[PDB]
Nucleic acid binder design. Structure first.
Ligand code: CL
Ligand code: CL
Ligand code: MG
Ligand code: MG
Ligand code: NA
Ligand code: NA
Ligand code: NA
Length: 326
DNA sequence: CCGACGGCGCATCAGC
DNA sequence: GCTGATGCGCC
DNA sequence: GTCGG
């Protein structure tokens, strides 16, 4: 982290644009610049130097010049002092409260953790659980705990049906020493792009994980995606582990490579790779890579037999998961 | 200048 | 009830 | 906010 001060500034600006301004392209621009700066292997000495990096333009270069000179950004100093901005930014830290809900709550005079706790009746299910575990959800998960969680999920899934394959993705698959949550890709040979030969495939797995008290709460749940909460078991006399966010995604088995590419991320890597694909005349999602016809309509799915095949199509050298933490 | 910027699952709601 | 829009979430 | 054409 040679340039932590700058990247922190850009991230705070990014969050302001998302949460307060509701300007999602500005949010993405700021995050893109922070990411490209984060991997730049020199300590940045000027805005001009930064402007040579793709994603950093005139305005960010200016902000970098202010920050290097003064150690701060007046623009952020003012934002931090704005009560309405501060409140909105805070409320969005609750899972299930986005920019829209946050502004609405502040309007109704709900703008603190205390306010939320006493207005539980005003929260939807997701938000209630987000509030319940507000503190826990802001803690990171050490890789050692992720390994324990992996063992539980892989072993319970096997107990349900030996044909399931569960793969832990997200920052974990990118080799991170700590993760924000647990991301599990699931496949079963009964669910392919051609047919669903068994119902409740995701349900059965969620059910089993609940039965063993690993999954503790549910934020949302459909046929292919579970979003919830889990917790490692603790030993006798041992303090409990924090509750953790878990996401499970059931992907057609024959579309595993596109799925694991997607669920491995990072999010910024996915945006960058998908944008590059478009430039190359392809569109990528978690299921397929398809050509774009002259018109602009996606064509048929191209054959994919490895993650690398996807990189080949768009003329990128293959990048291992550990090198995708953008 | 100015259009595009990744792609999609689940929850909630309005209109019919 | 359905469909489409929107919010919020995931990488 | 940045980029490409
Ligand atoms: Cl925007
Ligand atoms: Cl598709
Ligand atoms: Mg994750
Ligand atoms: Mg994330
Ligand atoms: Na640049
Ligand atoms: Na939130
Ligand atoms: Na996740």
């Amino acid at each position: 982290t040679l340039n932590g001060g700058i990247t922190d500034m850009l991230t705070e600006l990014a969050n302001f644009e998302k949460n307060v301004s509701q300007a999602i392209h500005k949010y993405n621009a700021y995050r893109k610049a922070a990411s490209v700066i984060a991997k730049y292997p020199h300590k940045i000495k000027s805005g001009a130097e930064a402007k040579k990096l793709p994603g950093v333009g005139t305005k960010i270069a200016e902000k970098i010049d202010e920050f290097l000179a003064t150690g701060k950004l007046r623009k952020l100093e003012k934002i931090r002092q704005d009560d309405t901005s501060s409140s909105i930014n805070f409320l969005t830290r609750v899972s299930g409260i986005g920019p829209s809900a946050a502004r609405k709550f502040v309007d109704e005079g709900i703008k603190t953790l205390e306010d939320l706790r006493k207005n539980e009746d005003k929260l939807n299910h997701h938000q209630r659980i987000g509030l319940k575990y507000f503190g826990d959800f802001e803690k990171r998960i050490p890789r050692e705990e992720m390994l324990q969680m992996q063992d539980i999920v892989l072993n319970e899934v096997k107990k349900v049906d030996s044909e399931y394959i569960a793969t832990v993705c997200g920052s974990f698959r990118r080799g991170a020493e700590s993760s924000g949550d647990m991301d599990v890709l699931l496949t079963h040979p009964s669910f392919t792009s051609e047919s669903t030969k068994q119902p409740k495939l995701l349900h059965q797995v969620v059910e089993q994980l609940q039965k063993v008290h690993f999954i503790t709460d549910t934020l949302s749940k459909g046929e292919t995606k579970f979003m919830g909460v889990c917790q490692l078991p603790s030993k006798n006399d041992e303090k409990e582990y924090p509750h953790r966010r878990i996401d499970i995604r059931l992907i057609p088995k024959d579309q595993y490579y596109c799925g694991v590419l997607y669920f491995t991320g990072s999010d910024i890597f996915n945006k960058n790779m998908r944008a590059h694909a478009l430039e190359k005349g392809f569109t990528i999602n978690e299921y397929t890579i398809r050509p774009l016809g002259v018109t602009g309509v996606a064509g048929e799915p191209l054959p994919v037999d490895s993650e690398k095949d996807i990189f080949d199509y768009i003329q990128w050298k293959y990048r291992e998961p550990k090198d995708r933490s953008e």
